[PDB]
Structure formats: structure tokens, C-alpha cells
């Protein structure tokens, strides 16, 4: 997999963000995770967390997996990085997302995120409290 540049346009919620990719505005849906909706428990904390992460980054990168790069809503499907730190993994490690939506071919970082979920659950963090 390879990291590609992108620039923040706008935080959206815990697992979507608006980024400019190859000069085009795009909504990105974070691979392999599921945050609560803003209106659900830990929803606002997940949105806040992703928002701070992406707004504070001096460098945003997106990394597509081997399978589909857009979903049925035309959202990009990527692993997204804030100054070298994966947002997808960070959310899971903090217990603000579950590993989810694991589809064959777009699952390179599955066991990295499952490892993070196991540690968040061990710590009873947030969703696992
Ligand atoms: C993460 C991800 C979501 N999706 C689609 C599946 C779900 O379909 P449905 O909308 O029919 O439930 C939806 C969940 O995204 P949200 O969690 O953003 O709602 O997005 C993909 O198709 N591929 C993916 O990799
Ligand atoms: Ca969600």
C-alpha cells in the first residue's frame, strides 16, 4: 500500500472527513472501522477526536487498499494518516470505534486494528466501559 497526499477540507464525523484528493473534493469513509453516529453514545467524542486529529495535522495522507476505492455513496475508502499516525487505528485504540465492515481485498490493516481493539477493550475504554 502507498500513502498519497491530501488536504483537509472539513471534519465531518468520527469516521468520515472531507479531503481534497488529486485536486477534487471528496468525502472519505475510514476503512475497517465504525464510529457511533453523532446522535449515539460516544458519537460526539468520536467526531471530536477525529476532528482534532485531522485539523491539527500539518500533513494528511490517504492510503487506499487493494479493493474498491469508492463505496456505493461515492465516498472514498482509505486509511487516513495525520502526521504519520493512522486515524483509523487511533480511533479503535481509544475505544471510540469498533473494527467493522471488513470486506475481503480491502483488509490489509485488519489485524493491526483488531490488536488495537483488544487493547482498548482490555482497558475498558469508552465504548468498552
Ligand atoms: C466502511 C465501508 C462502508 N460501506 C458502506 C456499507 C454500508 O451500507 P449501508 O449504508 O447500506 O448500511 C455503509 C456504512 O457506512 P456508515 O457507517 O458511514 O453509515 O457504508 C462500504 O460499502 N464499504 C466500506 O468499506
Ligand atoms: Ca458510522
Curated annotation (Swiss-Prot):
Biased composition range(s): Basic and acidic residues: 109-125
TM stretches of this protein: none
Positions that bind Ca(2+): 15, 34-35
Localization (cell): Secreted
Residues at the active site: 29, 37, 75
Region (Disordered): 109-129
UniProt protein name: Nuclease A
Organism expressing this protein natively: Staphylococcus aureus
Span of the entire protein shown here: 89 to 223 of 231
Amino acid at each position: 500500500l502507498h500513502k498519497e497526499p491530501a488536504t483537509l477540507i472539513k471534519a465531518i464525523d468520527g469516521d468520515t472527513v472531507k479531503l481534497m484528493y488529486k485536486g477534487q473534493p471528496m468525502t472519505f469513509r475510514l476503512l475497517l472501522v465504525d464510529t457511533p453516529e453523532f446522535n449515539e453514545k460516544y458519537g460526539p467524542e468520536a467526531s471530536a477526536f477525529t476532528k482534532k486529529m485531522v485539523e491539527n495535522a500539518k500533513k494528511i495522507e490517504v492510503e487506499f487498499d487493494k479493493g474498491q476505492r469508492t463505496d456505493k455513496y461515492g465516498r472514498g475508502l482509505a486509511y487516513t494518516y495525520a502526521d504519520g499516525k493512522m486515524v483509523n487505528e487511533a480511533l479503535v485504540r481509544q475505544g471510540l470505534a469498533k473494527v467493522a465492515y471488513v470486506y475481503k481485498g480491502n483488509n490489509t490493516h485488519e489485524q493491526l486494528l483488531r490488536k488495537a481493539e483488544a487493547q482498548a477493550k482490555k482497558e475498558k475504554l469508552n465504548i468498552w466501559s
